[PDB]
């Protein structure tokens, strides 16, 4: 079994998750919706590539049972490729506030210096957000079911291998296929949050030690709850996915900055989290 301490660690994590993860997104409202030179050209060309394969349609199911569906525009002149960014900015900001609250209730996080808490959140915001999004991702329909809101991937010619190209999309399918428990997701969030190698951390020693504790807890949880040889390397697969997610985070953050540079749209909280002066 798990040590008493490990049991307490998981309980605190689950408590935090339940208190700060609005899984039905019932409190997400008041958000925006799409309405109804050489160097510069080079910037735009890269920006178009940064989001041409991350397109989603949006669906809103009203209380009365009506349904609004929004299909994004095809990559044309320019501007139209940013039609959903304001909305996305609102959804992610909503998620980030939930992630900040999550960290705040964790005793291990509170004891850290305020400057370190800030550094850890900046480094892991995107990661924790995507880990939570994975729990509401329906791999059968390629849709993130967020309460009344739904974001569906626009399938193309290729299809599976087509999407598998985008690292973050492949990540969601792969992670979903592991069929993790709430406990494993929350431990993944903790390992990501307490990354000692985030740029700006001062208490490297303490953070590294905390991460290891969380990792050993996850490894142990798996050993105790799934002895089946089929899960022999589950822990290592998870740790490998977290390392990948970290690379994906850096890459999307760069994407954000590139877009921001030619089409500012980040909310105030996003500017702080991803280092945008604005």
């Amino acid at each position: 079994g798990l040590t008493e301490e490990q049991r307490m660690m998981i309980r605190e994590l689950m408590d935090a998750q339940m208190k700060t993860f609005d899984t039905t997104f019932s409190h997400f409202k008041n958000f925006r919706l799409p309405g109804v030179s050489r160097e510069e050209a080079a910037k735009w060309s890269q920006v178009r590539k940064d989001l041409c394969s991350l397109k989603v349609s949006l669906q809103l199911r009203g209380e009365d049972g009506s349904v609004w569906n929004y299909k994004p525009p095809a990559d044309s002149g320019g501007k139209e490729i940013f039609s959903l960014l304001p909305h996305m900015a609102d959804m992610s900001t909503y998620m980030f506030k939930g992630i900040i609250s999550f960290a705040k209730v964790i005793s291990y996080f509170r004891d850290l210096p305020i400057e370190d808490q800030i550094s850890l959140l900046k480094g892991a915001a995107f990661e924790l957000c995507q880990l939570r999004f994975n729990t509401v991702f329906n791999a059968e329909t390629g849709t993130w079911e967020c309460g009344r809101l739904s974001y569906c991937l626009e399938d193309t010619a290729g299809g599976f291998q087509q999407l598998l190209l985008e690292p973050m999309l492949k990540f969601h399918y792969m992670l979903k296929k592991l069929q993790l428990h709430e406990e494993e997701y929350v431990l993944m969030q903790a390992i990501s949050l307490f990354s000692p190698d985030r740029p700006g951390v001062l208490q490297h020693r303490v953070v590294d030690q905390l991460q290891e504790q969380f990792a050993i807890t996850l490894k142990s949880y798996i050993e105790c709850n799934r002895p089946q040889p089929a899960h022999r390397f589950l822990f290592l697969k998870i740790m490998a996915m977290l390392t990948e997610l970290r690379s994906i985070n850096a890459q999307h953050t760069q994407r954000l900055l590139r877009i921001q540079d030619i089409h500012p749209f980040a909310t105030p909280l996003m500017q702080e989290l991803f280092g945008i002066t604005g």
């Binding site: 506030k97 900040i100 705040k104 305020i114 400057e115 808490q117 800030i118 550094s119 959140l121 900046k122 700006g200 105030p268 909280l269 702080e272 989290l273």
Partner: peptide, 15 residues
Amino acid sequence: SLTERHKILHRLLQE
């Protein structure tokens, strides 16, 4: 300087 450059985050973490 870090807190100075992240007032929102700082505020959210102290409540």
